[PDB]
A paper describes a structure:
Collagen VI assembles from heterotrimers of three different α-chains into microfibrils, but there are many gaps in our knowledge of the molecular assembly process.
To determine how collagen VI is organised, microfibrils from bovine cornea, which we have previously shown are mainly composed of α1, α2, α3 heterotrimers, were imaged using cryoEM. Here, C2 symmetry was imposed, then relaxed using symmetry expansion to attain a nominal resolution of 4.33 Å in this region. Our previous modelling suggested that this upper ring of the microfibril contains the C-terminal vWA domains and the map also includes the trimeric coiled coil region, as seen in the mini-collagen VI structure, and a collagenous region from another collagen VI heterotrimer. This interaction is only formed upon higher-order assembly of the collagen VI heterotrimers into tetramers. Two interchain disulphide bonds are observed at the end of the coiled coil between the α3 chain and the α1 and α2 chains. There is one difference in disulphide bond pairing in the CXCC motif in the coiled coil region between the recombinant mini-collagen VI and microfibril, where in the mini-collagen VI, residue Cys2387 α3 bonds with Cys602 in the α2 chain, whereas in the microfibril, the equivalent cysteine in the α3 chain bonds with Cys604 in the α1 chain. A cysteine residue from the α2 coiled coil region (Cys600) appears to be connected to and contact the collagenous region, suggesting the formation of a disulphide bond between the trimeric coiled coil region and collagenous region within the microfibril.
Residue numbers in the entry:
A (entry chain F), B (entry chain C): 2193 to 2436
C (entry chain B), D (entry chain E): 587 to 611, 828 to 1027
E (entry chain D), F (entry chain A): 581 to 605, 815 to 1027
Write the structure that this text describes.
Amino acid sequence: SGYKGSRGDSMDQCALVQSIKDKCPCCYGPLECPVFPTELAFALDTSEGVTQDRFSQMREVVLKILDDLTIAESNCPRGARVAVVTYNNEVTTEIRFADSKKKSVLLDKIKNLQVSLTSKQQSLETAMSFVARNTFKRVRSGFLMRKVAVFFSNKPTRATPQLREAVLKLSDAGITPLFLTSQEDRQLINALQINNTAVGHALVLPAGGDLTDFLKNVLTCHVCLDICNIDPSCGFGSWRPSFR
Amino acid sequence: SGYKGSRGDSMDQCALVQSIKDKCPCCYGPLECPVFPTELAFALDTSEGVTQDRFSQMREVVLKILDDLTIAESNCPRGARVAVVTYNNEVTTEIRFADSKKKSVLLDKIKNLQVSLTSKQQSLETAMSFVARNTFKRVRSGFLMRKVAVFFSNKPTRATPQLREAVLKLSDAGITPLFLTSQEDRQLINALQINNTAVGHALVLPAGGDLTDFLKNVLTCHVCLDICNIDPSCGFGSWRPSFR
Amino acid sequence: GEPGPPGDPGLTECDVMTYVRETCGTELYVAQCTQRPVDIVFLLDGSERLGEQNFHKVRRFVEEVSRRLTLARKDDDPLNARVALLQFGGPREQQVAFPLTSNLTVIQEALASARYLNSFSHVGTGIVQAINQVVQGARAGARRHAELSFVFLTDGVTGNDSLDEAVHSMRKQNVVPTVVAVGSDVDTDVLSKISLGDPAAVFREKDYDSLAQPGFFDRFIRWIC
Amino acid sequence: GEPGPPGDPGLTECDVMTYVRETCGTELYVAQCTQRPVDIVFLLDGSERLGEQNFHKVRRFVEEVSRRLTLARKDDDPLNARVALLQFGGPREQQVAFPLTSNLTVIQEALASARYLNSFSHVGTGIVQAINQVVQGARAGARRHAELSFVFLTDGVTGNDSLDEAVHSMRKQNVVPTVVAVGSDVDTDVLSKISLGDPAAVFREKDYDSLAQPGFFDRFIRWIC
Amino acid sequence: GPPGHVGPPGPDECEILDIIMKMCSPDYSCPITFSSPADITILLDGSASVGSHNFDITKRFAKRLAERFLTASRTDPGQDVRVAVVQYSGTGQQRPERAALQFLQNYTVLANTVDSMDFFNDATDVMDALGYVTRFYREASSNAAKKRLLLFSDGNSQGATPAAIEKAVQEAQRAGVEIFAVVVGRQVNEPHVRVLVTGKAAEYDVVFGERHLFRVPSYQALLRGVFYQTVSRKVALD
Amino acid sequence: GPPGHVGPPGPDECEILDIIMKMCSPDYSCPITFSSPADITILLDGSASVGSHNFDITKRFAKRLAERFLTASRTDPGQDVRVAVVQYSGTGQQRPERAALQFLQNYTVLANTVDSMDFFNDATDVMDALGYVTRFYREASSNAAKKRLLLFSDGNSQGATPAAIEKAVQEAQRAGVEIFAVVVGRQVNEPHVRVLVTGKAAEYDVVFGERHLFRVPSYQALLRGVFYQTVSRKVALD
Ligand SMILES: *[C@@H]1O[C@H](CO)[C@@H](O[C@@H]2O[C@H](CO)[C@@H](O[C@@H]3O[C@H](CO)[C@@H](O)[C@H](O)[C@@H]3O)[C@H](O)[C@H]2NC(C)=O)[C@H](O)[C@H]1NC(C)=O
Ligand SMILES: *[C@@H]1O[C@H](CO[C@@H]2O[C@@H](C)[C@@H](O)[C@@H](O)[C@@H]2O)[C@@H](O[C@@H]2O[C@H](CO)[C@@H](O)[C@H](O)[C@H]2NC(C)=O)[C@H](O)[C@H]1NC(C)=O
Ligand SMILES: *[C@@H]1O[C@H](CO[C@@H]2O[C@@H](C)[C@@H](O)[C@@H](O)[C@@H]2O)[C@@H](O[C@@H]2O[C@H](CO)[C@@H](O)[C@H](O)[C@H]2NC(C)=O)[C@H](O)[C@H]1NC(C)=O
Ligand SMILES: *[C@@H]1O[C@H](CO)[C@@H](O[C@@H]2O[C@H](CO)[C@@H](O)[C@H](O)[C@H]2NC(C)=O)[C@H](O)[C@H]1NC(C)=O
Ligand SMILES: *[C@@H]1O[C@H](CO)[C@@H](O[C@@H]2O[C@H](CO)[C@@H](O)[C@H](O)[C@H]2NC(C)=O)[C@H](O)[C@H]1NC(C)=O
Ligand SMILES: *[C@@H]1O[C@H](CO)[C@@H](O[C@@H]2O[C@H](CO)[C@@H](O)[C@H](O)[C@H]2NC(C)=O)[C@H](O)[C@H]1NC(C)=O
Ligand SMILES: *[C@@H]1O[C@H](CO)[C@@H](O)[C@H](O)[C@H]1NC(C)=O
Ligand SMILES: *[C@@H]1O[C@H](CO)[C@@H](O)[C@H](O)[C@H]1NC(C)=O
């Protein structure tokens, strides 16, 4: 006999959720990010020259990001999972996808996380590969599973092929990275973007002053963007529904 | 490897029942026959010359025997099942092991059972074989199941090989027959018994008068004899408790 | 090889369980086949819900059954059992088939030419026709007391215009039934009526193909004989 | 032959159920093996409750697993993964085995002469000795960030004189635990402590022989890589 | 051999409504709107292949279908919403008479006819039944209306060949009525049912078949759940 | 190969007792009578093969056994009923001190020792344990008394060969005490436990074998039910 028939049609990933969302009572009232359950991976840089005050700044940024987001304490596929790591010439996991179980405990752990003053010279490619092949080694199930990674850099990245290979691997892994660094690098954007199809933006971060102006952008637009109801004109580029 | 080892020991068949009996409350108080659930097969005879009044007498005998005994209305393995047939040179089933479900309905059926006056000549061996291989084609389960058949005859049986072979088949079938007939026949006793091994006695019934004596004999030590505590001298012979 | 495994325990938990349940308070024990004089007549309703391929499967099943059971030489109350089958229908209000006979060649020929009615079965009319035909055959074959057992190969769902009268005739005709229903869809009323107030005189088969399962075949032959 | 069977529904009932649960409100999806830089160091307790025959079966399983995984040529952080195993025990307070190395012939030679302790073994001392040995090996083998995953092939029931301290040290040493328990008799406390607060980081196998079951082997090789 | 045809598409709106309402706990049930006037005459089996109790549950399903279709708020009071019922059996058995039943609006008369029809106990004939239905439409339904029809079947019928079914369905199409097939069980002649659904055996359209076919495993399951509302709404949608 | 040995005989009095008492709605529990004065010293495993929780449940079962034996109405006030408890482990590990534990009528020292012993975490050692038990009997128990003993075992121990256990059990028999074996689980060296039970490997008497051996699937199952009653009663019967 012949082999099995082809897969049947589908109501499209985008608007079936639209329907069910206008349909599941109280789920179309108050909103709480993330829009869908997702994994969020913070990676922190202790590169030589990273000022301790700047480290406190990034610590506050991550703490605020956590507070704005809920958590999936139970096994129900709803809420945010977290993973916090530190990276240098080498890497060292701090909290993985399993330990985090409550919001307060996670906040306390991150606030109490030791600051590892050091002098090793940075190589962001190692952290890229680590997150690509170690942190996301296992992730929670879900037909609309969403993954996001946030990084750091106290020095602009080099312009090398290995970076292109690493970002390609990240893309193949399903991640949707959102790097953060003091200053822009057109070469960084070019390496990230693939044949004009963006893979992840490279935002900017302040050395003081106001913060909310960009906290609102990051929270509403990248970490917990709706899968289908995208903001009209948030961020120059072409956006991305999910996966790649 | 070798085949399965031999089946181990046991606590005998009866004495275990003695033990469990003393130990199960309310089951060693008011006795009710049959001692253990049993099948009882009445088979009436309509051979030529059978006086209608004698038929009434046997009807009363069967009715009394039924009333003195309980029944197993439900599927619980406890109580008496009944099967009533009529036999001649041929046979005709009347009520089988399945139809009877309540004592009142069984008594009503037996009392209202059609009386079939006829003239065909008697052949008890045919009824013997019929009961041996038709009525007991299916019986209720139970490690201590008892099966008894009661018959009739308005004429002494002949002395032929067929009857001895038939009674051998009966014994091989596990039945414990108790024939009833007007008059004795040493040939009948010899054919029934074998090699100093009794199969079933041949009692005597009256042409009118008292009945409680022999009726008591049958009800106590033949129909519902405890397989364990056989009466001292109820019926001359040697008895044969348990299957044969 | 190595020594055999240890034997079965003494009065296994189930053994004492049954003993106690018996003392004060499913499966039925039947003596295995002993070739006692038996007369068996099948009954396969032509209801369109049977199926041509399922009709062929039932033909194969009946062939196997008639092959396994011993066959008598002749009549006049000899040992061993006979066999018969018919395929009555609703349209034309009757049908005919070979009578009870041990000439298995006739059975082969009839099965080869067997026609699947794909028609109806007012089970009452069919059963009364069958009882009349088998009574005629038995009269043609002397007394041969033996017995008279019917096997119903039908769900039983069909018109019941004259079911009760035929049931009463069967009761008076010293008959013994045995019903083997197949498929989940079955009516309890017809099965109970034809089973004559028995809860264990009915077999259940998941599908028609299961009729070829050796276990069920062995169980059926054990019950009938 | 005949045409293939018709396809399955586009979105089965469970599909829509999962969708609705996801919108408002087990199995974990792991990317298949990609020869990512990996370093695995087994751990098999010497407790006498393991079993000589079970020790042989575990040897077979370990050699099969080493065969299945791709083996790196050398160190200084190439691609591909390495392997190591040890069989620490209670008596003598220490025991050693071959270090991490991809040269498979050394693995075979060491396994062939493998000795079954069949003796008590406190898990804490074993794990601390193992982490010390693997740290020494890694330092001998440059940085090789890769990772460090430990597979606990043991029930884990044993002396806990210094369990918690060793667990803390492993936690600080960026390790990825993984447990394959065998048999119903298992203590949840030890599994939870080694699993580092994970509910799905433990596999269960009814009998040690099932380690040769293709399904479990495939699942384990998938999970590790 | 060649691979099998594409399976049925995903569930439509009605059953996803049902599943969300089952545990997630705005208008619900399964609203319908007869966008344009049309007719429906649910055809009910009458051959023994169903039986007595199965025929009874089929009658209950038919009554529910008629109720749901008729109650559906008419998209226009200027035009009508039309429903009917008939029972088919062996050749020349299609209750009521040809000139009796018209498009019904009050539910009670249709319900009484539905509850009064008697099992025919006549062989499974589909030729004459299809001819009856198509000629009745040809004579009766107004020209403007674009109608619809349901039909129970097992594809099995004495003296039946694929050519005859194809010709009859072609005659029906010439009459100008699209058809839908709902079947129960699997003791079904697949080629004949497929032909009836499509009418073009060789160039069978997978999309047409999957849209026009409903499969129900058990007679009891037919009434259970929200299957009736799903199928009725599908009939509603153009 | 040759067929296997005869399986265990049937349920004894005490389990038929609880099975009848379960449903049948007259003495109950599981009465005992120490027909003649004697002693018993239940030996408890302490090797890793048991484990923490298994060791604890074994301790509970031992406590229950001892309490049942001691409470059993002595058949003679003029004589005594005597029991004791000790834990065995790797060679030369058998609490308490030699002169410490004597036959006991009270429950203080026995209960405290039962609830206060500690797991040892060492490989099973039967040789020195059996030697300790037999020498303690030889020195301590009164000459007239005919004693009894119980033992948890797995037939596995470092430096163990069948001949050595043969000799050890022969020495124990020379001491003049019959022995009974009770074991849990099936990860047990069958020949060694059979040897321990019998004393003559070549001639494994069926009667001696089945009577002297009790089998348990799991540690938890040991405490469940009235198994403790059955084992104690069997120990009682001469
Ligand atoms: C590395 O793997 C090898 C097997 O691939 C392990 O055993 C080696 O087996 C070969 C096969 O007989 C031995 O042959 C010898 O090879 C050497 C070159 O290494 C050659 O000069 C000799 O003339 C002979 O052909 C080889 O000796 C043997 N390895 C050793 C060390 O003896 C080997 O144990 C693994 N580990 C190593 C090589 O460190
Ligand atoms: C069945 O129809 C009758 C009358 O039809 C009504 O008028 C039609 C134009 C249409 O609008 C139907 O839906 C209407 O129901 C209903 O019963 C009759 O009602 C009238 C008015 O009260 C009364 O004089 C008659 O005696 C009624 N006939 C009876 C009692 O037999 C009936 O409600 C309809 N059935 C339904 C709606 O289920
Ligand atoms: C252990 O015995 C003591 C007293 O001994 C009692 O008399 C003996 C001759 C013998 O028959 C034992 O079985 C008897 O129990 C029990 O109670 C103790 O009594 C003394 C007397 O004042 C008191 O000083 C102790 O404190 C008591 N022990 C306590 C309170 O633990 C004791 O009950 C017996 N053992 C158990 C477990 O109860
Ligand atoms: C009865 O059985 C016989 C075989 O036992 C069948 O076979 C025929 O027997 C007759 C008897 O003389 C032969 O003449 C034929 O040649 C046999 N048939 C063949 C094909 O060789 C016989 O057919 C059976 N009875 C009937 C009526 O068919
Ligand atoms: C016997 O015949 C009667 C009618 O002659 C059947 O009566 C129907 O039984 C079904 C069983 O569920 C009911 O649903 C119907 O309401 C009854 N009446 C009618 C008019 O259909 C009866 O079912 C038949 N027995 C069977 C088929 O076993
Ligand atoms: C080792 O772990 C055990 C439990 O995981 C700790 O406490 C024991 O808990 C079990 C629970 O079943 C009890 O049965 C034991 O009695 C407990 N221990 C003792 C000594 O009684 C234990 O504290 C841990 N550490 C050590 C050294 O045993
Ligand atoms: C080219 O663009 C497509 C479309 O997004 C993308 O899938 C692919 O990976 C890109 N390849 C390269 C080499 O940029
Ligand atoms: C002889 O007598 C015994 C005693 O019951 C009986 O079992 C047996 O069937 C009789 N016949 C033979 C041939 O032994």
